[PDB]
Structure 1
Amino acid sequence: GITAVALYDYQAAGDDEISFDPDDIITNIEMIDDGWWRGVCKGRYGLFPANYVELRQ
């Protein structure tokens, strides 16, 4: 469906947020919050740092 890649490394400092690395691209990424998004890592659902990530075409 939708793919997204991160720019740099970040640590999800939340309860429902996951971390990802630039070399680690995830799928199923949507925008729930005007400032935050959602990321899926091989089934692992969580939050995607809109400031440290980007939605791929």
Structure 2
Amino acid sequence: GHMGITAIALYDYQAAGDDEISFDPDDIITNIEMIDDGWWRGVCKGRYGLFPANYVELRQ
């Protein structure tokens, strides 16, 4: 419900810093904020931070 904008990971991503998150393919990213065109912010598996926008696919 209150998950905001959500997406599915298209690829593996390893956080390059403590301000980034990591995810595996098919993981769900929620509460997405599109703070810029290349990098978004959201929640994945209880972690909060930045990730590359083109590594995910928006749901609906």
Report the TM-score when normalising by structure 1: 0.77
1:3-53 superposed Cα distances (whole Å, 9 cap, x missing partner)? 111111111112300111122112111211221101212543111211312
Report the TM-score when normalising by structure 2: 0.74
Report sequence identity in percent.
Answer: 98
Point out 4+ residue stretches in structure 1 off by more than 3 angstroms. Answer: none
Q: What is the count of residue pairs matched by the alignment? A: 57
Please, what is the CA RMSD of the aligned residues? Answer: 1.7
Contact kept? 2:9, 2:24, Cα under 8 Å:
yes
Q: Distance in 2 between matches of 1:38 and 1:27?
A: 9
**Structure 2: 5+ residue stretches without partners:** none
Which protein is richer in helix relative to its size? 2
